[PDB]
Each structure stands twice: as C-alpha cells, then as structure tokens.
Design a protein around this ligand. Structure first.
Ligand code: K
Ligand code: MG
Ligand code: MG
Ligand code: ZN
Ligand code: ZN
Ligand code: ZN
Ligand code: ZN
Lengths: 49, 96, 48, 48, 255, 113, 264, 97, 46
RNA sequence: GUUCGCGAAGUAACCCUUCGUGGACAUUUGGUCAAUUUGAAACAAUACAGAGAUGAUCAGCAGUUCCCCUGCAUAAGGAUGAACCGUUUUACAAAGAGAUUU
C-alpha cells in the first residue's frame, strides 16, 4: 500500500479514511509503550487491519 | 490554507534562479501577460455624461475599468495613465 | 488521501507533517481548501 | 528532512546492531540481588 | 474448438500497462487516479491490445468452476491470468447464452450490473429496460489514422472484425454520417463485442499506416439508438408481435 | 414553539409551533421519537391524553386533529371551526375536549371524535 | 418493514438458503434511494453471488422480482408483459418510468401500482388475461455492376465454384439464418448480405465445400418459405459488388426485383 | 471531530440545519414572531376573511406605526378601523416596552 | 423456501451504511378519502 | 498423518520394522468488490461580463427554496453565500340607455 493507484485499492482507501478517527488512540498506545533509556529494542504486541 | 500563509511548497529540485529564467522565457508567449491593459476597480472621479445615450454618471460610482500606461510622460518623467470604463446603460466605452 | 478526495492537490503535506500550498491560491481555492481544527489537530499530533 | 520519506525499517534499520543503552554500572557484591535483572524490559517476568 | 486447448496468456504481468493515465493536469490525484489542476488534452487512446479469437480462446478454471461470466480482459485482449482465470476465455455461444438466460435481464455477460437509463453518451454497460442488440460504430476516421478509404472497403473491414465475435443479424455502413451499425443474434454477443472492439483500430498489417497505429484515437463503439427508418420500425413491430405470440403459448400452457 | 403538553402516563412530552408539526420527545434521551405531520399551518394548542387519541392538536388551518401516535396518523380530523382554533382545554373528569375560534366554542367526545 | 420479494427461479431448489441482510447497504437501481440489501448464493459452493438490485416498494409497484426484474407471477420482462396485456385490453397500459432523479424518488413513494402490475398482482385478473389470450392464439451505376453480378449464368454440376451470389433475400431474414441453413445442408462460410440491396454473396473455405453446397438444392435456397435464389459466382466478390452508397443499393434492389418478377 | 468530518465526506451534509437563536439573530426572529402575532390577530377578527393582499398592507401600517413611535410623531391613519387600530397600538406598545 | 437470514459483521473501518447519503425527497401527498369542511351559514367598516 | 485393534512377512518374540485392513481423531474459506479509455471528483485556464439597498458607497441580520459549500458544530463564514428583480384578466353582478339579430 505505497502508491494505491490501481482500482483494487478503492475499498482500502475508504478503510484508510475511516481509520483516521482512531489515530489518537493509536498514538496514545504507541507513545505509552515508548522504550525507556535503559532498554535498546522493545518488542511490542500489535493489532493491525 | 489561510490567507497569511508564510511558506509555499517548492519541489526538491527547484532552483529559484533557473526557475525565474525559465518563467521569463515562458512569459513572452502567455496571452494574459502580454495584453495591453490591466483590469482595475475604481471610482468615477467626477460627474460625467455618456455621449452615445446621454446617461449621467455621478462621481464616486464604482466601475470595473481598464488601465493603460501611455507612451507619453508628463515632462518626460512622470507616468500618465488612461482609465476606461463602459457606460452602465448602453455599454459604450468611456475613457479619461 | 483526505486532502486528495477533497480535490485539494494544490496543497502538499510534507513527510514531517507541515501543510504548504504548492501555488498562490485563488479566493475560490482558499474557500474550498479551508481545512478545520479537526484536520490540523490530527496533523500536529502526528507531527509530535 | 521534510522532503525525505520515513525510512523502511527492514532495509535500513533491522540489520544494525543497537548501541549500548543508559545502564549504570552495578556492583557485583553490593548490588548482587538486583544486578542480574534490573535492566530487563519486564524485570522478573519469568521468575515464578 | 476452444474446448481442445488450454487458454493462452494474452499479456504477461510485467507487460501490463501502468494504472496512471496520460497526463492532463498538473498534479496526480491519489484518490481519484486522475489528474487535477487543469484539464487539457484528450483522454482517448488506441488500445495496445486486441483479441484474436481462434488463437487466444481456450479452457480456464471458469469452465471447471461452472462459471457463467466471460472475462472482461480476454475481450480487451489483455488478460494476465490465461488458463488460471476464473472467467470464461471464449466468444459467447448459444450454450453459454442459455446458461446466462436468467441473469441476462439485469447483468452483462461480463457480470456487470445494468442501469435504468443509458448514459447521455450512449456508452457503458446498457439498460435493463431496453434489451438492445445493436452497436453504433463511430470514430472510424481515427480508427484508420485518417487514411482515406472507400465506403465499401470500410464496410468490409467492419464486417471482418465484428463477425469473429458472434452471430450477426445485420451490418450497415452509412457514408453520409460515416458510421456503422452492427446488430447481433444475442445481446450477450453485443455486450461482448462492444468491449472487444472499443478503442481498437481498423487498420491491417497490410496497411502502410500499421507502424503508427497507436497514435490517434481508436473505434468508438456504443449502444445504438432506435432506427428511425420506417422499414426497420415495421420490422421491429413484426418481431415484437411474433415474440408476443410465442410467449402466449408459454402463459397458456402454464395456466 | 407555541405549546408543550406533558403526557399523563409516559415519560414523554409533546411540543408544536409555527413549523406545523407536533414532535414527541423521550424526556430522558432528548430524542424526537415521533413527528406528527398533517396540519397545513401553525399549531396553537397541544393536549396529551392517556388513551388513543393520545395527542389532540389545534391549528391556524381551522382544524382540530386527533392522533394515533404509534401509526403517526390522524384518528379523526375535525373541520367544524371557521377560523384559527387558537384555544383548547381538556375536561379533567370526563373524556372530552373544548376548542374555540372567534365567537365559536365547541366541545368534542374524544372516544369517537 | 416488508419482507423481500424473490422468485423461486432465483432461489433455486435447495431446501435451505442462507441469506445476508444489510440495512441501507445499497441504492435502488430504479429510484436511487437507500434500501435493505439481501444477497445469497443458490448453494454454498456456487461461485456467483445473487443480490437484490431494487427495493421492495419499487418491486411491488411493478409486480417483479427484486433479483431479476421479471414479473413475479408470469416470469416475463415488463415490456413484453405490458405489450401482452395491451393486446387483450383495447386501451393501452405501459409502465411509465421517471427520467429525472427527483421524479424517480417521488414516483417510488406513491403506493399505486404501475402499468400491467395491478392486472398481474392478483390471480383473478391474471387468470382472466390468460383465458382471453387463448382466444387470441385460437384466432445509378447499376448498368455497370449488373455485368459484375453473375446474372447471365446458371446453377450447374460441372463448374467448380467456391463463391456464390444470393438474391431475392427478404429484408426480414437475419444473416445468421442464411449461414445456419447452409450449415444444415453441409452438415457442419464467409457471408456478405446487404439488406438494402436485397442480395448478397457467399464464399466457402475450399472448393469441395462449394461443390457439396451446389450438390444440394439458377438455384434456390429456403428460409421459412422465403425463396432465396442462388447463382455460382466464379468472379470473386466483395462488399463493393452491391453498390458504394445507399441509393445505389436501393436502385440495385429494384432492378433485381423486376428481374425476379420476369424470372418467375 | 474526525468522525463528523469523514461522515460529511461520505454521507454528505444534512439538508435541514436548524439555526439557533443567537444574539446576532435575536432582533430578526423577534420581528418575524411579532409580525406573525399581529397578522394572526387581525386575520382572526376581520369579518370578510380576505387574506392574500390584505396581510401585506396591514403589516406596512404596523411598521409605519413603529417608525412614528420612534420619531414621536402621532400615528393616525384616516379611515383606519378602530379595532385594527387598537391591535396595532397594542403590539407597538409591547415592542416599545 | 426456508430462508436463514444472517447479517455479517461489517468492516469497522468502512462506512457502516454503504448506501446512506444526504439526499432530498419530495414526498407524494396521496389520499383516497375526501374530508368535508363542516361550517354553517357595512363593508366600509373594515 | 497420529493412534487403537485385527490379519500376512520379519522375530514361535504376539509389544518393536514392513504390508493388508476395521474404527477413532480433523469437516465446507472468500466476494455488496475483476486490472487503464465508455457508469460520471473538483479546481484551473480562456473569452466576455461584473458587485443587495440607490443619487452614490458600505456594515449588516433574517426570511422563502425539490441550491448548497467550508466548518467538530445546534457556533461562524461563504458578496447581507447564491437563487428572489419576471409574469400578471372571470366566484363578475345590478340598474339604466343607444345601435340591432329574433
Ligand atoms: K455586505
Ligand atoms: Mg450568513
Ligand atoms: Mg443569506
Ligand atoms: Zn451610454
Ligand atoms: Zn481472463
Ligand atoms: Zn427503489
Ligand atoms: Zn428472480
């Protein structure tokens, strides 16, 4: 989903715009799990569409 | 974007000097860059009467008019401009 | 995609989430492209 | 830069070994009860 | 027969054309897949691809899956999937018309849903009200790259290409209007042939123009309006009466 | 808005005005559950009633209307008044409504219209 | 909210059909207003998915199936139905369809049946119509091209000919019927017919096919008792044989007509 | 916020936005309701029930009475019916208060 | 025919009602029943 | 495939390896949707016109509408957002009086 020019991505484009209302939640969840200074690389469980 | 935006987007390859030089080459061929008059909004500076249809035009009426810089200059130094309106009833061109 | 669905391709979004016009805009373009606080709040949170 | 896309993680980042984090050097004797585990991501998460 | 062989791959996946259309504005709109900021230059272009029915037809997964609908891109001569295609890769025939005979009232032979009203352009899929079997063939000058050609010669070309694509009732060419009308036996063949011949050239390999065939605009194949010719109108009335009388038999025998 | 009437048994109110409709509101959720359409002019009075017809309304169109609120339909239209039916009242102890024009007060049995 | 109106021929013959309901999932093809979409498959492993294209109130207005728009009693299309009824009723009835979108929305909400629908929406009327239907069934360069056309010569055994000239073609005849009857005779073929000329030409693949064609009965060919006449055309033909314009074709047709009337 | 925006993008904007009575709209809505009140009273009391042109005439007399009140000019129209005169003066006094 | 009616779970990131739009409609005022109006029997003064 | 059981051959080994075979375990995805022109995004450009009240210029705030746009919006803005400027004949009678059909 880099360019999304083909007709196959119409439903995906609609899903993208509908995802926009849930971004601040995702931003909270990301920043909440931010690595602290003593850890190099934090593996995190994710949920994705 | 707002009226008072500070920045416009330039493409990453944009060189301003080459861009101006290219746009200068382009400007000699565009229609609206080479037409002989500039459209302006202006008030009628004095009361005047159309000669085609005898309509009185009062002072301070707003018009959409054409501005021409003339070749002649006052004492060869100061710019003179013709200001052209069109009569509101009969659409005939009035100039001063 | 929200910018482009609204037809505002004359606005460009940087990869650091600044929104800039690509050209000096007509008055009709300015009225048509007057995005609101929802978009801008979303954009600046993404920027942070 | 504003005009550079966000980096591909797998191409540019996944292969690089990370640098040392901020860890204070603990004493092998005088911190012995915490030295083995203080800096884990979830300390003692496997110690039943 | 097409049943004797597996379907040929018409175009490879790497050979398929780009999805971004030819530029007609200053900026590409990632939503609409079209150019914004100005609109200049024509959007029509000649198809790089053309169906070759005896060469390209063959069995696919659709024949094994019990599929009804034909492949849209097979008709366009640009199907990527070849024998792995879910859709049927052959010219429609009475067997498949019979299999389509329920869905045909509201669907295209390509399985596209029909509309109430035709487009003002008379292009597109067509109306579920009309059951039209006739194609208008325009843009013939562009389809020949503006080559001068005699009217009977043009008619012979149109006769050749459209007769590969189905059973035909009538072909007529009108010199004054410089347009052709092709009527099929079945609406499914009119549906198919429209998409098969849209944006194509009428040129030959034998022509002097063949090496620049891609430059102009191709054939403009649309649904035909009702024929204003009174002979055609009374013929239409006669076949309407015949269809009605044949239907009375079914209604009476069922009730 | 020209009038409000509180339903005697339901947690419901009726309201009407110059927009020529009666809107019934659930008190709690503040949703306009039902809009009653049929008056041809401003509504002057609304009366809520414990059984069908559960709303009675009077209008500048010179009608009194008796409503089935579940169907969204009139039970009866009363067309005996000449002018705007500006005033109305329920009788507290018998199943009847009075209504008035200029010079013309009338009383109606609500079980029948 | 009314139930879906789907015919048995859409639903098939399986004992059970799973159906998916989607409130306000689709916009009606007739009236453009939203409606509750139903969609189903005739069996679990059938690969085509059938959906309601029109809303229930448009369907009851027309007495048609929501999934195939054929009449929900007689299983025939609206145009043919209204035409059939208007042969039994002297005063014509037809389904008048809105063209403006606001009129499409307006028309769909009035609860009155349209065209032939009410005459088919109850059994008494529909049965009366079919009872009456049983009574119905109980009741200028011509002077040059005429030497290019083979009209001077005859249908013969000896000359090997791959191409033939067809005339006395009635305009009612489609091209496919001609090809089909030749296919029947040969037990299976490039055809040009110009209907404004009322004549045509037939070209075979190889000489043995033409010889087998001339082996079966100037000659004659039959299409529903239209007597197409046939002549061997040794000189090869093209579309130009019948005239370059419409007027030339019509003039040729009249010339061929008087030649036929002399031959008969 | 984003939900309402994207809802407008797909569903479109509601056809029936009811503007509320803010202080920019207060005087105009007062005028409309007062005008309707005067018209209801006069069309109810007139014996002949003739409406279409008579209404537009009567409310001009109302507006003239208001101008006279603000000017402190005595509003007196010769041949005005006494009851309609009383109705107009009644509504002018309420607006004045 | 016995029909099992289900309602499959919608993609929460797509619009919930695909056919839904803001569109205006003029409703027909059809009515079969005529309603009677039931009244009974110096212009310079007014 | 794993496993329980029973036959044939290894190994008179009844367990282990192989072959034949009975049973158990596991049971119907997905699509409202196909990949460029012909099932419908908008601005911009070009030419011409041009700014609500009226003598002139301008602040506005409304209303009606099967016009909506921007906006989180029941706020506000869009020229006071636009459209509004046109068209206009009968619920038609009474009294006379002069030409006239009958
Ligand atoms: K203003
Ligand atoms: Mg405003
Ligand atoms: Mg306004
Ligand atoms: Zn003048
Ligand atoms: Zn294919
Ligand atoms: Zn509908
Ligand atoms: Zn059906």
């Amino acid at each position: 989903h880099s360019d999304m020019a083909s007709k196959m991505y119409n439903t995906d484009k609609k899903a993208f715009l509908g995802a926009l209302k849930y971004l601040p939640h995702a931003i909270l969840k990301l920043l909440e799990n931010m690595p602290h200074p003593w850890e190099q690389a934090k593996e995190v469980k994710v949920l994705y569409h | 974007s707002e009226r008072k935006a500070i920045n416009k987007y330039y493409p990453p390859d944009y060189n301003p000097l080459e861009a101006e030089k290219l746009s200068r080459k382009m400007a000699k061929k565009l229609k609206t860059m080479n037409k002989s008059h500039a459209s302006i909004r202006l008030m009628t500076p004095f009361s005047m009467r159309c000669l085609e249809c005898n309509e009185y035009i009062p002072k301070s009426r707003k018009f959409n008019g054409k501005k021409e810089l003339l070749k002649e200059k006052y004492l060869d130094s100061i710019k003179i401009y013709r200001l052209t309106i069109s009569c509101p009833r009969c659409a005939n061109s009035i100039a001063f | 995609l929200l910018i482009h669905r609204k037809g505002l391709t004359y606005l460009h979004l940087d990869y650091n989430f600044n929104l800039k016009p690509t050209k000096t805009l007509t008055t009709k373009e300015r009225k048509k492209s007057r995005l609101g606080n929802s978009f801008h709040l979303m954009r600046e949170l993404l920027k942070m | 830069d504003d005009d550079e896309p966000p980096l591909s993680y797998e191409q540019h980042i996944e292969n690089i070994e990370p640098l040392d984090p901020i860890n204070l050097p603990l004493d092998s004797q005088d911190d012995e009860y915490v030295k083995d585990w203080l800096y884990d991501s979830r300390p003692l998460e496997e110690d039943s | 027969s097409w049943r004797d062989k597996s379907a040929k791959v018409q175009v490879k996946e790497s050979e398929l054309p780009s999805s971004i259309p030819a530029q007609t504005g200053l900026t590409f709109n990632i939503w609409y897949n079209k150019w914004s900021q100005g609109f200049a230059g024509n959007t029509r272009f000649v198809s790089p691809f053309a169906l070759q029915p005896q060469l390209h037809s063959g069995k696919t997964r659709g024949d094994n899956d019990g599929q009804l609908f034909f492949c849209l891109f097979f008709a366009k001569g640009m199907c990527c999937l070849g024998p792995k295609c879910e859709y049927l890769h052959h010219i429609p025939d009475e067997e498949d018309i019979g299999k389509l005979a329920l869905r045909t009232e509201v669907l295209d032979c390509f399985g596209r849903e029909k509309f109430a009203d035709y487009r003002e352009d008379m292009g597109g899929i067509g109306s579920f009200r009309k059951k039209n079997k006739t194609l208008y063939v325009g843009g013939i000058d562009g389809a020949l790259n503006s080559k001068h050609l005699k009217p009977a010669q043009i008619e012979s070309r149109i006769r050749f290409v459209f007769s590969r694509l189905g059973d035909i009732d009538r072909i007529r060419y009108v010199e004054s209007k410089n347009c052709g009308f092709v009527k099929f036996k079945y609406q499914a063949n009119a549906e198919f042939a429209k998409e098969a011949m849209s944006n194509q050239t009428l040129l030959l390999p034998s022509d002097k123009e063949w090496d620049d065939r891609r430059e102009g605009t191709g054939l403009l194949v649309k649904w035909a309006n009702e024929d204003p010719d009174p002979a055609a109108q009374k013929r239409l009335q006669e076949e309407l009466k015949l269809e009605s009388l044949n239907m009375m038999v079914h209604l009476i025998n069922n009730n | 808005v020209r009038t409000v009437s509180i339903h005697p048994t339901l947690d419901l109110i009726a309201t009407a005005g110059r927009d020529s409709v009666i809107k019934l509101w659930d008190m709690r959720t503040r949703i306009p559950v039902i809009t009653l359409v049929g008056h041809k002019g401003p509504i002057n009075q609304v009366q809520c009633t414990p059984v069908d017809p559960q709303v009675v309304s009077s209008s500048t169109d010179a009608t009194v209307r008796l409503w089935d609120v579940v169907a969204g339909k009139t039970m009866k239209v009363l067309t005996h008044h000449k002018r705007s039916v500006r005033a109305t009242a329920l009788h507290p102890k018998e199943f009847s409504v009075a209504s008035a024009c200029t010079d013309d007060i009338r009383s109606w049995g609500l079980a029948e219209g | 909210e009314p139930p879906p109106n789907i015919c048995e021929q859409c639903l098939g013959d399986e004992a059970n059909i799973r159906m998916t309901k989607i409130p306000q999932g689709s916009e009606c093809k007739i009236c453009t207003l939203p409606f509750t979409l139903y969609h189903f498959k005739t069996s679990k492993r059938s690969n085509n998915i059938i959906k309601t294209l029109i809303c229930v109130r448009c369907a009851t207005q027309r007495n048609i199936c929501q999934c195939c728009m054929l009449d929900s009693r007689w299983h025939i299309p609206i145009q043919l139905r209204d035409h059939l009824i208007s042969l039994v009723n002297e005063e014509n009835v037809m389904t008048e369809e809105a063209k403006n979108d606001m009129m499409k929305r307006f028309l769909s909400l009035k609860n009155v049946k349209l065209g032939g629908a009410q005459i088919t929406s109850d059994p008494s009327e529909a049965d009366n119509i079919v009872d009456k239907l049983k009574n119905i069934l109980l009741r200028v360069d011509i002077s040059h091209i005429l030497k290019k056309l083979p009209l001077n010569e005859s249908f013969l055994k000896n000359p090997s000919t791959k191409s033939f000239f067809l005339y006395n073609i009635d305009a009612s005849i489609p091209e496919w019927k001609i090809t089909d009857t030749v296919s029947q005779l040969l037990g299976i073929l490039s055809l040009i017919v110009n209907h404004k000329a009322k004549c045509g030409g037939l070209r075979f693949q190889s000489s043995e096919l033409g010889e087998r064609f001339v082996s079966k009965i100037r000659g004659v060919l039959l299409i529903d008792r239209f007597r197409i006449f046939i002549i061997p055309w040794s000189s090869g033909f093209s579309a130009a044989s019948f005239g370059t314009n419409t007027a030339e074709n019509i003039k040729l047709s009249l010339s061929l007509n008087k030649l036929i009337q002399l031959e008969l | 916020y984003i939900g309402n925006l994207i809802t407008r993008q797909f569903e479109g904007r509601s056809n029936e936005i009811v503007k509320t009575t803010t202080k920019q709209r207060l005087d105009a809505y007062y005028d409309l309701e007062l005008r309707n009140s005067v018209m209801d009273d006069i069309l109810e009391m007139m014996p002949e029930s003739i409406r279409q042109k008579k209404a537009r005439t009567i409310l001009q007399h109302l507006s003239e009475a208001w101008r006279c009140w603000k000017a402190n000019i005595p509003w007196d129209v010769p041949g005005m019916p006494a009851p309609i005169k009383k109705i107009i003066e009644r509504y002018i006094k309420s607006k004045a208060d | 025919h016995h029909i099992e009616v289900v309602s499959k779970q919608m993609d929460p990131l797509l619009p919930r009602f695909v056919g839904k739009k803001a569109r205006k409609v003029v409703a027909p005022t059809e009515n079969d029943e005529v309603v009677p109006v039931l009244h009974m029997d110096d212009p310079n003064e007014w």
